[PDB]
Each structure stands twice: as structure tokens, then as C-alpha cells.
Symmetry: C4
Subunit: 208 residues, 4 copies
């Protein structure tokens, strides 16, 4: 767990994210918990020119390394880390289906049993606030109190997990759920959902 | 027909399934009939780290090999094998269009002549029951009595055939039919279908 | 213009067709005009196991080479060649958007100026008839009298041109037009179209 | 900044455009500002057979190099350059979502904060006029007066920027916004938007 290994995974996460179709051109930022703060992708530099030494260290006070410009969205990555002590990785993208659901300002309800991967019977949608602001950061910290993923109204998605592998995986799963919801919603509104008792069985089963 | 050749095809089936866009992140399990039970993919291990010796043998009594954890959905693979003696391979995924049709709880009717590939004038949708349960297993065995593919409400798809090649192929065909149905359904409901006499000509023709 | 060069292009056309997303699993057949009949893809054999010597020669009387089984849809390829003397290549697939428009039994009207690539102000839809029958063949020959592409109700698409390159290209263009029509149709019906005078200017311009 | 380096990027831009799914078969043309006119892709030649010496130089008077046929849509590339002095690269495609929005003849409103990348609170739609005409050229020059991207009714998209990298990037971003708008529009009309004050904060923030 040296710095450069963590920077290679961050870069590999951006690459896989783009290959999975979740990341569409210069949007998206990834981070990992490290020392007293985090390592995050830089602003500006396109994913394919990224090299290990581009990765930026931001400490717990919010100070970033000299000569590097962290992602313009770094503050809600730090919000995530202080609101969810168990989170070690944070993935953010503007994936098209998640973002369309966030434009309608709706939570994703329990239309599939995999909704439980993010911790409960829904994928919440946090209210709009300008990117990079303290106000956005507060909404995200409140939405992640009992969920590992949230939509951001008029914006995109955030997912957090114990490592980058699982955070990408979750991010991906919520984009599938989002696409499932939009496709069925164009046909029938509201969309049929599983009951809370049924999601409670599935959560228990996922613990086992 | 040694064990390792069957395990390479299983792994190759997961890979092709993901490349075809039918398998979206850690969902999906494949099996083949073998000896008195079956070889199935393990739970946990991501498709790309899979190696031949990861494949799990489950006998006819439901006992799995020592030190391996079979897919969490193995029971409906075994249900398939006892309900359809002619089936030698079973493919299961959560492909997005099939699953959206299963959220609406509808069968796919005869909107295209290829519906006959699964044996009749429809692609049925079996009722929801918690993954991995005996109750799910019974619904699947009843849906496969006269069809080689079925949707699973709020969940996904199962397809069975004489070998893995044909099972993947069928799985793929039902995802196309699913997408055809959802796209036309957003425009007109109900969707125009071919009559039963016409599907009966096509079945005879497919036998020849 | 020896046989094997024509068979490599046919095979290359199947490959490109699959890579472009127009051909989804074992559907689709391609042919070229040759001598007194045509070279067509065989039935059964999956596109990726195809080799030059798999290609089947069918003469002008409809007799096929010994030991080879031509595509199950060969008769409407021969219909195309006798109905359009200028056609030297024929491409058929079940591409998802074209086929969805053919399930609604509608022609594609002039929603984009590229509709003129197939010769007029529309992409017609020929009535359903069982695959491989004389009756299907007659509908296709009548739809291609003044168009180079047609939809086949409840089935798919046929496109013909002076060579395989242009036939694939046209096929592709009609799948785009199909997707344009379905996406706008879910929002507004009817969809705005360009007038016949405007398509007449574009045709003249395309001749120049 | 020699000619051949500029021709390699143009060709690389066509390739990336096709790989990103924005360019579907022989549509699309790219240009860069050069000397007193521009370098543009030729008409006819498919993107994959393009070589550096295929690139056509058109001077400020509209005269093209000897023995080369410039794109059939070159005139609105020249319109762009005279209407926006800061533009050094121009990308045009018929990307499916942008074009579907242009068939409905609607501007893309502020459904996402990234709408500000093209300079304001919208992505305008310029009125139809036959491809390659002076009349089309005038509409494009008026739509680009205060925007870096515009839709073309019944046709496609144009994007301009300081270099090819940024022009492709913008083009891509507008196709995402287009897809966001069509997907939400099928569910609710009108689609929720951010207010002008909010886009004004985002523009200021994007300047910083
Ligand atoms: Zn963002
Ligand atoms: Zn499952
Ligand atoms: Zn067919
Ligand atoms: Zn154009």
C-alpha cells in the first residue's frame, strides 16, 4: 500500500469506467482514502494522458500538493470520507442513465433485488447545489448516511465502498438500475416494485 | 469431454456473455451437465480472474466440492437439469432488456418470427421469489416445461440448450426480442403480433 | 474477380456487420452477383467459423453446389437480383431498430435528408410472409422496384447496391434512420418530415 | 504546425469520432483553420482509407486544391471560421441523439450544468436548408454568434473550438446532453431545467 500502487489503481479505475460506458469525456473523478486525506485525480488532464505522478494528495485540512490542481469536485470526495468512516474509495461520474434519473429528481425505488447492494430499498437523489460548493458537500454527506450510492440532481452519481474494485462495481450496478427504471417508466408510471419485507429478506441474505 | 475442457468453455461463455453486453458486472452464472450433477461458476470471483480450477462440481444430491463456494443461484440450475432432461447447458444473466420486461411482469409475445427458437409462441415470465430459494426453483422448473428460456420477474433470464454455444445464442436472441418489445411498447400498446397459425408454420419450418 | 476474393469480402461483410451492431447472433446473410447466379453464405455455420470454401454457389435455376446448404433465406436474394438488374450485392440482417419499425408495419418517412440514399422519400415496409417462401420473395421484388432498401414486416431489412461496401453502408444508414424514427416517435406522433420538393432537391444534389 | 501534422490530427479526429459512436458511416467532416483558409476532409473516401495527402486545402476565396474534392459540406466550415474568429477547429457529424433532437426542431435547454460548455444556457437548433447551400451557411453563422455548438434541423450537429481535441470533446458532450434530453422527454414534457441565475453562476465558475 505505497502511494504509486494506489495511483495506478485510480488511473486503472478511470480507464475501466470509460470502457464500461459510465464515463463520457473529461467528466468523472476517482479518489482513495490515504494517510490523513486522500489521493484524487487532477483537474484538466484527460484520462488517457494520466500518469501516476499526476495524482494529487489532499490532506485532512484540504491543502493540496504543490504544483497540482485536484479535481474541481474534490470537496464532496472529502465529505464522503468524513461522513462514512468505512468508505475507502469514491467514484463519481455523469453516467447517462443515472443522470437522466437525477434530472427528474427521483429516487430509484426497488424495481430489482440488486437495489440492496447500496444498502437499503432505494438509491436516493440529493438536491441540486453548484458543483464544488460547501452546500453540495452537505447534501452528499446527508445522502450517504445510510446508503453507499446517491444520485445528484441535474448532475450525476457518487458511489463509495471499501476499495476501488467494489466502488466501480457498485457504480456500474446503479447505472443498470437507472437504465431499468427509465426504460420501464416510459411504458408504465409508477413502476412495479418489491415490498420492504422482500428487500429485508434480500439484505439479510446478502449479509450471509 | 474431460472436466477441464468443460471448465474452459464455461469461462469462455462468461467472457463472450460480457462482450455481447448481456452480462453487467458480477451478475450471471453458467453451468453444464456433468456426471451426476453439474459444473457451475463459483460465487464471489469476478469473471476475469476466473481460472479452470475455480469451477465448482455440485453432485446430484446438491453437495459441492470441498473449499469452493458455488454460485449463490445454483439451485435453479439444478432445477433446470431435472425439469428438462434434454438440457446440457444453462445460462443465467440479468441482461437489461429481458430484466426490464420482467419488471413489468409480462411475457414476450410473438412480435417476431424468431420467438420460436425458445420452443413456442412466447417467452414466459415466472413469478418472483427470493434468489436461491426452493420456491424460485419450482417456478423456473414449471416455466421451462415447454420452453427453453424464461424471464424471472424482477430479476433476469434463464436459457437452456444442448450445449453452451446454443445456450448463449438463445440467451442473446431473447435479449434482442426483449429490446424489440420494449422499444415498440413505448410507441404502441398492445404491440402487433403474429398469429398462432403463423408461429406453427415457423416451428415446423425450424424443425426442417 | 475470382471466386475466392468474392468469398473473402462476403465473410468480411458479415464480420463488419457484426462489429457495427447490425447483426445479432446467427441471423443475417450476404450474397454477391456471380456468373449466372450468386455466392451466398451457408446456413448453420456461425459467422466466426466461416471460411472461403463455406461460401455456396447457387446458379440461375436455383440449384446449389453439392454438399453445401445455402442460407435458409436465399430465395429473396435471388428475387432481388432479378428485380434489380443494377444490384450486385445484397445484405440482409435483423438489425434491432429496422426490425422494431417493421413490427409497427410502417414505412420510414423523410425525417432526415439521408433518406434519399435508398432512392426516394421513404424506406418502405413489405408485408409479412413466412421466411424462405415464394410469397415473401414476391413482396421483396415489388418493394425493391424503386428503392434499394426495404423493411420486412415482423422480420428485418434488405439492402442492395453495386458492391458489398455500398450495400453495408446503406444497410447501416437505414438502421440509423430507423433509430432516429423510433426515438422521435416515442416523443411525438407524427414525426416532422421534409416535404417532397425538398427530397427532390436532395436527390438531384446527390446525383451531382 | 506543419501541414502534415494537422492532417494527421484531422484523420485521428475522424477515427476517434467513429470510435466514440458519434460518426455512423460516411457522414461527418472535420476541418482546421490553416493559413488563409482551411484543411478539410475530402468527399467520397471512407474514413479508414484516409491518408494525410487526401486532406484538402481550401483558401479564403473558396478555391480548392487541384485534383481533390473537398467535403460536400465545406461551406458551413468556412462560415464558422468567418463568424467565430476564435474558432480553429470545426467538427460536424450526424450523431443519432443530436440529430433526433434536431428533427423535433428544439433547442436543448438547461437540463444539466454542463450545458455551459457551449457558452450559455442552451444548445440552439438552426433552421433547415439544403446541405451545401449558402442559405444553410447563413443560419449556421447566426447560430454560432454566441454559442460554440448548434444543432441543424433534420440534419445533425456542428461544434467549434480552439483545437480539435476540444472540438471533439464538446461534440461528445452535446451528444450526451441530447441523449439526456430525449430520455427524460419521453417520460415528462417539459423537462425540468436549471434557472438562468444558476447557469450564470456555473459560467463564472467555468471561467475560474
Ligand atoms: Zn460531477
Ligand atoms: Zn440472478
Ligand atoms: Zn431474415
Ligand atoms: Zn451533414
Amino acid at each position: 500500500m505505497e502511494r504509486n500502487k494506489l495511483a495506478r489503481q485510480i488511473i486503472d479505475t478511470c480507464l475501466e469506467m470509460t470502457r464500461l460506458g459510465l464515463n463520457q469525456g473529461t467528466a468523472g473523478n476517482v479518489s482513495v482514502r490515504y494517510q490523513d486525506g486522500m489521493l484524487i485525480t487532477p483537474t484538466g488532464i484527460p484520462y488517457e494522458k494520466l500518469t501516476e505522478s499526476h495524482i494529487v494528495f489532499i490532506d485532512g485540512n484540504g491543502k493540496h500538493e504543490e504544483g497540482k490542481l485536484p479535481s474541481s469536485e474534490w470537496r464532496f470526495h472529502m465529505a464522503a470520507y468524513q461522513s462514512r468512516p468505512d468508505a475507502n474509495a469514491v467514484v463519481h461520474n455523469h453516467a447517462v442513465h443515472c443522470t437522466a434519473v437525477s434530472i427528474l429528481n427521483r429516487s430509484i425505488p426497488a424495481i430489482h433485488y440488486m437495489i440492496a447492494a447500496a444498502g437499503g430499498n432505494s438509491i436516493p437523489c440529493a438536491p441540486y447545489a453548484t458543483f464544488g460548493t460547501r452546500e453540495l458537500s452537505e447534501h452528499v454527506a446527508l445522502a450517504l448516511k445510510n446508503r453507499k450510492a446517491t444520485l445528484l440532481q441535474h448532475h450525476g452519481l457518487i458511489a463509495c465502498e471499501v476499495n476501488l474494485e467494489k466502488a466501480l462495481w457498485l457504480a456500474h450496478e446503479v447505472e443498470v438500475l437507472a437504465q431499468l427504471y427509465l426504460t420501464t417508466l416510459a411504458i408504465t408510471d409508477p413502476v412495479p416494485v418489491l415490498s420492504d419485507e422482500e428487500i429485508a429478506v434480500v439484505l439479510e441474505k446478502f449479509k450471509t
